[PDB]
Amino acid sequence: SPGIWQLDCTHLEGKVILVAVHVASGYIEAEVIPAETGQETAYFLLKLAGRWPVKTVHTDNGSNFTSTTVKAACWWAGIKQEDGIPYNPQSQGVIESMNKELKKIIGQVRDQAEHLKTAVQMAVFIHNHKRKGYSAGERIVDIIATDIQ
Amino acid sequence: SPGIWQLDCTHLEGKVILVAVHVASGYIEAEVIPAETGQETAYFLLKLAGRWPVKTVHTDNGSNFTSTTVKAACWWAGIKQEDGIPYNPQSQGVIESMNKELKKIIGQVRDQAEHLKTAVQMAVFIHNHKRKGYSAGERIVDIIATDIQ
Numbered sequence: 001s002p003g004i005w006q007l008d009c010t011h012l013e014g015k016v017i018l019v020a021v022h023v024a025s026g027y028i029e030a031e032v033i034p035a036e037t038g039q040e041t042a043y044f045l046l047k048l049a050g051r052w053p054v055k056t057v058h059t060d061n062g063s064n065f066t067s068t069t070v071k072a073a074c075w076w077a078g079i080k081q082e083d084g085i086p087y088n089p090q091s092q093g094v095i096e097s098m099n100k101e102l103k104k105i106i107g108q109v110r111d112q113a114e115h116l117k118t119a120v121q122m123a124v125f126i127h128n129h130k131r132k133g134y135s136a137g138e139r140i141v142d143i144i145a146t147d148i149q
Numbered sequence: 150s151p152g153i154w155q156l157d158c159t160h161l162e163g164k165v166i167l168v169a170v171h172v173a174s175g176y177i178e179a180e181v182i183p184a185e186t187g188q189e190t191a192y193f194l195l196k197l198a199g200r201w202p203v204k205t206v207h208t209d210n211g212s213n214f215t216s217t218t219v220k221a222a223c224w225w226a227g228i229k230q231e232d233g234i235p236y237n238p239q240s241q242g243v244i245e246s247m248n249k250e251l252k253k254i255i256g257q258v259r260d261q262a263e264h265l266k267t268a269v270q271m272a273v274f275i276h277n278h279k280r281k282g283y284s285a286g287e288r289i290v291d292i293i294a295t296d297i298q
Protein backbone atom coordinates (compact mmCIF):
# COMPACT_ATOMS: atom_id res chain seq x y z
CA SER A 1 0.00 0.00 0.00
CA PRO A 2 2.75 2.58 0.67
CA GLY A 3 4.19 1.90 -2.83
CA ILE A 4 0.97 1.90 -4.93
CA TRP A 5 0.34 4.68 -7.45
CA GLN A 6 -2.42 5.28 -10.03
CA LEU A 7 -1.99 7.06 -13.36
CA ASP A 8 -4.70 9.42 -14.52
CA CYS A 9 -4.98 11.41 -17.74
CA THR A 10 -7.29 14.42 -18.16
CA HIS A 11 -7.76 17.13 -20.81
CA LEU A 12 -7.78 20.93 -20.76
CA GLU A 13 -7.19 23.71 -23.33
CA GLY A 14 -6.54 21.21 -26.13
CA LYS A 15 -3.76 19.70 -24.02
CA VAL A 16 -3.19 16.66 -21.85
CA ILE A 17 -2.53 16.67 -18.10
CA LEU A 18 -0.88 13.48 -16.86
CA VAL A 19 -1.32 12.81 -13.14
CA ALA A 20 0.06 10.21 -10.74
CA VAL A 21 -1.88 9.68 -7.52
CA HIS A 22 -0.46 8.02 -4.41
CA VAL A 23 -3.54 5.95 -3.58
CA ALA A 24 -3.21 5.71 0.22
CA SER A 25 -2.68 9.50 0.70
CA GLY A 26 -4.18 11.37 -2.28
CA TYR A 27 -0.79 13.04 -2.90
CA ILE A 28 -0.17 13.92 -6.58
CA GLU A 29 2.44 14.80 -9.18
CA ALA A 30 1.41 16.10 -12.59
CA GLU A 31 2.71 17.40 -15.93
CA VAL A 32 1.33 19.02 -19.09
CA ILE A 33 2.15 17.12 -22.31
CA PRO A 34 1.10 17.68 -25.96
CA ALA A 35 -0.43 14.20 -26.18
CA GLU A 36 -0.43 11.01 -24.10
CA THR A 37 2.15 8.75 -25.73
CA GLY A 38 4.07 5.74 -24.44
CA GLN A 39 7.20 7.90 -24.59
CA GLU A 40 5.72 10.73 -22.46
CA THR A 41 4.28 8.23 -19.98
CA ALA A 42 7.59 6.35 -19.69
CA TYR A 43 9.57 9.54 -19.01
CA PHE A 44 7.00 10.71 -16.41
CA LEU A 45 7.15 7.37 -14.56
CA LEU A 46 10.96 7.47 -14.49
CA LYS A 47 10.80 10.94 -12.90
CA LEU A 48 8.23 9.83 -10.32
CA ALA A 49 10.09 6.64 -9.31
CA GLY A 50 13.37 8.55 -8.82
CA ARG A 51 11.54 10.83 -6.36
CA TRP A 52 9.23 8.46 -4.37
CA PRO A 53 9.44 4.69 -3.70
CA VAL A 54 7.10 3.52 -6.47
CA LYS A 55 6.45 -0.24 -6.20
CA THR A 56 3.26 -0.63 -8.20
CA VAL A 57 1.65 1.52 -10.88
CA HIS A 58 -1.93 1.10 -12.03
CA THR A 59 -1.75 2.35 -15.60
CA ASP A 60 -4.54 4.66 -16.86
CA ASN A 61 -5.49 2.79 -20.05
CA GLY A 62 -4.75 -0.29 -22.13
CA SER A 63 -2.42 1.54 -24.55
CA ASN A 64 0.00 2.54 -21.79
CA PHE A 65 -0.36 -0.93 -20.26
CA THR A 66 0.60 -2.40 -23.66
CA SER A 67 3.30 0.12 -24.66
CA THR A 68 6.76 -1.45 -24.85
CA THR A 69 8.40 1.89 -23.99
CA VAL A 70 6.28 2.06 -20.82
CA LYS A 71 7.18 -1.57 -19.96
CA ALA A 72 10.86 -0.70 -20.48
CA ALA A 73 10.59 2.22 -18.02
CA CYS A 74 8.79 0.08 -15.43
CA TRP A 75 11.46 -2.58 -15.84
CA TRP A 76 14.23 0.03 -15.54
CA ALA A 77 12.77 1.65 -12.42
CA GLY A 78 11.77 -1.60 -10.71
CA ILE A 79 8.04 -0.88 -11.05
CA LYS A 80 5.36 -3.56 -11.16
CA GLN A 81 3.09 -2.42 -13.98
CA GLU A 82 -0.53 -3.36 -13.37
CA ASP A 83 -3.81 -2.61 -15.09
CA GLY A 84 -6.08 0.08 -13.62
CA ILE A 85 -9.38 -1.82 -13.74
CA PRO A 86 -11.51 -0.41 -10.90
CA TYR A 87 -12.44 -3.77 -9.33
CA ASN A 88 -13.42 -1.47 -6.48
CA PRO A 89 -15.97 0.79 -8.21
CA GLN A 90 -15.32 3.75 -5.87
CA SER A 91 -11.96 4.26 -7.66
CA GLN A 92 -13.65 5.74 -10.77
CA GLY A 93 -15.58 8.22 -8.63
CA VAL A 94 -12.50 9.24 -6.64
CA ILE A 95 -10.52 9.85 -9.87
CA GLU A 96 -13.39 11.75 -11.54
CA SER A 97 -13.77 13.86 -8.42
CA MET A 98 -10.05 14.65 -8.26
CA ASN A 99 -10.00 15.70 -11.95
CA LYS A 100 -12.88 18.15 -11.33
CA GLU A 101 -11.12 19.53 -8.22
CA LEU A 102 -7.84 20.01 -10.15
CA LYS A 103 -9.56 21.79 -13.07
CA LYS A 104 -11.34 24.03 -10.57
CA ILE A 105 -8.02 25.04 -8.93
CA ILE A 106 -6.47 25.56 -12.38
CA GLY A 107 -9.33 27.94 -13.23
CA GLN A 108 -8.84 29.79 -9.93
CA VAL A 109 -5.10 30.41 -10.68
CA ARG A 110 -5.16 30.46 -14.48
CA ASP A 111 -4.83 34.26 -14.82
CA GLN A 112 -1.80 34.39 -12.46
CA ALA A 113 0.20 32.46 -15.07
CA GLU A 114 1.04 33.04 -18.72
CA HIS A 115 1.37 29.29 -19.42
CA LEU A 116 -0.85 26.32 -18.62
CA LYS A 117 2.02 24.23 -17.21
CA THR A 118 2.55 26.87 -14.49
CA ALA A 119 -1.13 26.83 -13.50
CA VAL A 120 -1.05 23.03 -13.29
CA GLN A 121 1.97 23.08 -10.95
CA MET A 122 0.20 25.76 -8.87
CA ALA A 123 -2.70 23.30 -8.63
CA VAL A 124 -0.40 20.45 -7.59
CA PHE A 125 0.93 22.74 -4.84
CA ILE A 126 -2.51 23.74 -3.57
CA HIS A 127 -3.87 20.17 -3.72
CA ASN A 128 -0.92 18.63 -1.82
CA HIS A 129 -0.90 21.36 0.90
CA LYS A 130 -4.69 21.48 1.40
CA ARG A 131 -5.65 20.59 4.99
CA LYS A 132 -8.56 18.13 4.98
CA GLY A 133 -6.71 17.50 9.76
CA TYR A 134 -3.66 16.46 7.74
CA SER A 135 -2.62 17.32 4.17
CA ALA A 136 -1.93 14.80 1.39
CA GLY A 137 1.76 15.78 1.60
CA GLU A 138 1.80 15.01 5.33
CA ARG A 139 -0.01 11.69 4.85
CA ILE A 140 2.38 10.37 2.16
CA VAL A 141 5.46 11.17 4.29
CA ASP A 142 3.88 9.55 7.39
CA ILE A 143 2.77 6.41 5.50
CA ILE A 144 6.17 5.83 3.92
CA ALA A 145 8.06 6.67 7.14
CA THR A 146 6.09 4.09 9.14
CA ASP A 147 6.77 1.52 6.42
CA ILE A 148 10.54 2.21 6.47
CA GLN A 149 10.68 1.56 10.24
CA SER B 150 16.54 22.10 8.88
CA PRO B 151 13.82 19.78 7.48
CA GLY B 152 12.73 22.58 5.08
CA ILE B 153 16.13 23.80 3.80
CA TRP B 154 17.11 23.25 0.16
CA GLN B 155 20.12 24.32 -1.91
CA LEU B 156 20.10 25.07 -5.62
CA ASP B 157 23.00 23.89 -7.73
CA CYS B 158 23.67 24.38 -11.43
CA THR B 159 26.13 22.24 -13.43
CA HIS B 160 26.95 21.81 -17.14
CA LEU B 161 27.12 18.85 -19.52
CA GLU B 162 26.89 18.36 -23.31
CA GLY B 163 26.44 22.10 -23.92
CA LYS B 164 23.41 22.03 -21.63
CA VAL B 165 22.51 23.01 -18.10
CA ILE B 166 21.47 20.64 -15.30
CA LEU B 167 19.59 22.38 -12.49
CA VAL B 168 19.63 20.52 -9.19
CA ALA B 169 17.92 21.06 -5.84
CA VAL B 170 19.50 19.34 -2.84
CA HIS B 171 17.74 18.70 0.44
CA VAL B 172 20.63 19.66 2.71
CA ALA B 173 19.91 17.44 5.74
CA SER B 174 19.46 14.23 3.65
CA GLY B 175 21.33 14.62 0.33
CA TYR B 176 18.07 13.85 -1.55
CA ILE B 177 17.86 15.54 -4.98
CA GLU B 178 15.55 16.61 -7.79
CA ALA B 179 16.97 17.72 -11.13
CA GLU B 180 16.06 18.90 -14.64
CA VAL B 181 17.82 19.61 -17.94
CA ILE B 182 17.25 23.15 -19.28
CA PRO B 183 18.70 25.00 -22.33
CA ALA B 184 20.10 27.76 -20.13
CA GLU B 185 19.78 28.90 -16.52
CA THR B 186 17.28 31.77 -16.60
CA GLY B 187 15.14 33.34 -13.87
CA GLN B 188 12.15 31.89 -15.69
CA GLU B 189 13.49 28.30 -15.71
CA THR B 190 14.58 28.60 -12.07
CA ALA B 191 11.19 29.99 -10.99
CA TYR B 192 9.26 27.17 -12.69
CA PHE B 193 11.61 24.51 -11.18
CA LEU B 194 11.15 25.92 -7.66
CA LEU B 195 7.37 25.94 -8.05
CA LYS B 196 7.47 22.25 -9.02
CA LEU B 197 9.73 21.37 -6.08
CA ALA B 198 7.67 23.25 -3.47
CA GLY B 199 4.43 21.61 -4.62
CA ARG B 200 6.07 18.21 -4.02
CA TRP B 201 8.09 18.68 -0.76
CA PRO B 202 7.69 21.18 2.13
CA VAL B 203 10.25 23.76 0.98
CA LYS B 204 10.73 26.45 3.65
CA THR B 205 14.09 27.91 2.67
CA VAL B 206 16.03 27.92 -0.58
CA HIS B 207 19.70 28.83 -0.84
CA THR B 208 19.93 30.14 -4.38
CA ASP B 209 22.91 29.06 -6.53
CA ASN B 210 24.10 32.49 -7.68
CA GLY B 211 23.46 36.21 -7.43
CA SER B 212 21.46 36.43 -10.66
CA ASN B 213 18.80 33.98 -9.41
CA PHE B 214 18.89 35.69 -6.02
CA THR B 215 18.22 39.01 -7.78
CA SER B 216 15.73 37.80 -10.42
CA THR B 217 12.24 39.25 -9.90
CA THR B 218 10.65 36.17 -11.51
CA VAL B 219 12.45 33.96 -8.99
CA LYS B 220 11.35 36.25 -6.12
CA ALA B 221 7.76 36.04 -7.44
CA ALA B 222 7.88 32.22 -7.38
CA CYS B 223 9.34 32.15 -3.86
CA TRP B 224 6.63 34.56 -2.75
CA TRP B 225 3.94 32.47 -4.46
CA ALA B 226 5.14 29.18 -2.95
CA GLY B 227 5.84 30.55 0.53
CA ILE B 228 9.61 30.08 0.18
CA LYS B 229 12.22 32.10 2.07
CA GLN B 230 14.77 32.97 -0.60
CA GLU B 231 18.28 33.17 0.82
CA ASP B 232 21.75 33.57 -0.64
CA GLY B 233 23.96 30.47 -1.00
CA ILE B 234 27.18 31.87 0.45
CA PRO B 235 29.08 28.90 1.96
CA TYR B 236 29.72 30.46 5.38
CA ASN B 237 30.51 26.85 6.20
CA PRO B 238 33.30 26.13 3.68
CA GLN B 239 32.53 22.37 3.53
CA SER B 240 29.37 23.23 1.52
CA GLN B 241 31.40 24.00 -1.64
CA GLY B 242 33.18 20.66 -1.38
CA VAL B 243 29.95 18.73 -0.80
CA ILE B 244 28.33 20.38 -3.87
CA GLU B 245 31.41 19.87 -6.07
CA SER B 246 31.55 16.23 -4.97
CA MET B 247 27.86 15.68 -5.73
CA ASN B 248 28.25 17.20 -9.22
CA LYS B 249 31.13 14.81 -10.02
CA GLU B 250 29.11 11.84 -8.69
CA LEU B 251 26.07 12.83 -10.80
CA LYS B 252 28.14 13.25 -14.00
CA LYS B 253 29.74 9.86 -13.32
CA ILE B 254 26.31 8.17 -13.04
CA ILE B 255 25.13 10.02 -16.17
CA GLY B 256 28.16 8.61 -18.04
CA GLN B 257 27.40 5.11 -16.73
CA VAL B 258 23.78 5.25 -18.08
CA ARG B 259 24.23 7.62 -21.02
CA ASP B 260 24.08 4.92 -23.74
CA GLN B 261 20.85 3.42 -22.33
CA ALA B 262 19.03 6.64 -23.28
CA GLU B 263 18.57 8.53 -26.54
CA HIS B 264 18.18 11.89 -24.73
CA LEU B 265 20.20 13.60 -22.00
CA LYS B 266 17.13 14.41 -19.89
CA THR B 267 16.42 10.68 -19.53
CA ALA B 268 19.98 9.94 -18.38
CA VAL B 269 19.74 12.75 -15.81
CA GLN B 270 16.50 11.32 -14.36
CA MET B 271 18.15 7.87 -14.29
CA ALA B 272 20.92 9.51 -12.26
CA VAL B 273 18.43 11.14 -9.88
CA PHE B 274 16.91 7.67 -9.37
CA ILE B 275 20.25 5.96 -8.69
CA HIS B 276 21.47 8.76 -6.39
CA ASN B 277 18.30 8.85 -4.27
CA HIS B 278 18.10 5.03 -3.90
CA LYS B 279 21.83 4.46 -3.22
CA ARG B 280 22.41 2.87 0.21
CA LYS B 281 25.32 4.66 1.94
CA GLY B 282 22.94 2.21 5.88
CA TYR B 283 20.01 4.36 4.72
CA SER B 284 19.35 5.98 1.33
CA ALA B 285 18.84 9.73 0.73
CA GLY B 286 15.19 8.97 -0.10
CA GLU B 287 14.75 7.19 3.23
CA ARG B 288 16.47 9.99 5.17
CA ILE B 289 14.32 12.82 3.72
CA VAL B 290 11.07 10.96 4.53
CA ASP B 291 12.27 10.17 8.09
CA ILE B 292 13.46 13.76 8.75
CA ILE B 293 10.22 15.34 7.57
CA ALA B 294 8.05 12.71 9.32
CA THR B 295 9.73 13.36 12.69
CA ASP B 296 9.23 17.09 12.16
CA ILE B 297 5.50 16.67 11.39
CA GLN B 298 4.96 14.78 14.67
Ligand SMILES: NCCCCCC(=O)N[C@H]1Cc2ccccc2[C@@H]1Cc1ccc2c(c1C(=O)O)OCO2
Pocket residue numbers: 039040042043046069072073074076260261262263264265266267268
Ligand atom coordinates in the same frame (compact mmCIF):
# COMPACT_ATOMS: atom_id res chain seq x y z
N1 LIG C 1 21.47 3.69 -27.51
C1 LIG C 1 20.37 4.65 -27.78
C2 LIG C 1 19.07 3.90 -27.65
C3 LIG C 1 18.21 4.61 -26.63
C4 LIG C 1 16.86 3.94 -26.53
C5 LIG C 1 16.93 2.76 -25.59
C6 LIG C 1 15.71 2.80 -24.74
O1 LIG C 1 14.66 2.27 -25.08
N2 LIG C 1 15.89 3.50 -23.56
C7 LIG C 1 14.79 3.68 -22.66
C8 LIG C 1 15.15 3.15 -21.29
C9 LIG C 1 14.30 4.01 -20.46
C10 LIG C 1 13.95 3.76 -19.16
C11 LIG C 1 13.14 4.66 -18.51
C12 LIG C 1 12.70 5.78 -19.17
C13 LIG C 1 13.06 6.02 -20.48
C14 LIG C 1 13.86 5.12 -21.13
C15 LIG C 1 14.40 5.14 -22.53
C16 LIG C 1 13.46 5.52 -23.67
C17 LIG C 1 12.95 6.92 -23.59
C18 LIG C 1 11.62 7.04 -23.23
C19 LIG C 1 11.00 8.27 -23.11
C20 LIG C 1 11.76 9.37 -23.36
C21 LIG C 1 13.07 9.27 -23.72
C22 LIG C 1 13.71 8.07 -23.85
C23 LIG C 1 15.16 8.08 -24.25
O2 LIG C 1 15.54 7.17 -25.03
O3 LIG C 1 15.90 9.01 -23.83
O4 LIG C 1 13.63 10.49 -23.92
C24 LIG C 1 12.56 11.34 -23.48
O5 LIG C 1 11.32 10.66 -23.29
Ligand SMILES: NCCCCCC(=O)N[C@H]1Cc2ccccc2[C@@H]1Cc1ccc2c(c1C(=O)O)OCO2
Pocket residue numbers: 111112113114115116117118119188189191192195218221222223225226
Ligand atom coordinates in the same frame (compact mmCIF):
# COMPACT_ATOMS: atom_id res chain seq x y z
N1 LIG D 1 -1.76 36.37 -17.64
C1 LIG D 1 -1.26 37.47 -16.80
C2 LIG D 1 -0.25 36.90 -15.83
C3 LIG D 1 1.14 36.98 -16.42
C4 LIG D 1 2.10 36.17 -15.59
C5 LIG D 1 2.27 36.81 -14.23
C6 LIG D 1 3.45 36.19 -13.55
O1 LIG D 1 4.53 36.76 -13.48
N2 LIG D 1 3.17 34.95 -13.03
C7 LIG D 1 4.19 34.25 -12.31
C8 LIG D 1 3.69 33.82 -10.95
C9 LIG D 1 4.47 32.58 -10.76
C10 LIG D 1 4.66 31.94 -9.57
C11 LIG D 1 5.42 30.79 -9.55
C12 LIG D 1 5.96 30.31 -10.72
C13 LIG D 1 5.76 30.97 -11.92
C14 LIG D 1 5.01 32.12 -11.93
C15 LIG D 1 4.64 33.00 -13.07
C16 LIG D 1 5.73 33.39 -14.06
C17 LIG D 1 6.27 32.23 -14.84
C18 LIG D 1 7.56 31.86 -14.50
C19 LIG D 1 8.20 30.81 -15.12
C20 LIG D 1 7.52 30.15 -16.10
C21 LIG D 1 6.25 30.51 -16.45
C22 LIG D 1 5.59 31.55 -15.85
C23 LIG D 1 4.20 31.86 -16.33
O2 LIG D 1 3.86 33.06 -16.43
O3 LIG D 1 3.46 30.88 -16.66
O4 LIG D 1 5.76 29.72 -17.46
C24 LIG D 1 6.83 28.76 -17.58
O5 LIG D 1 7.99 29.09 -16.81
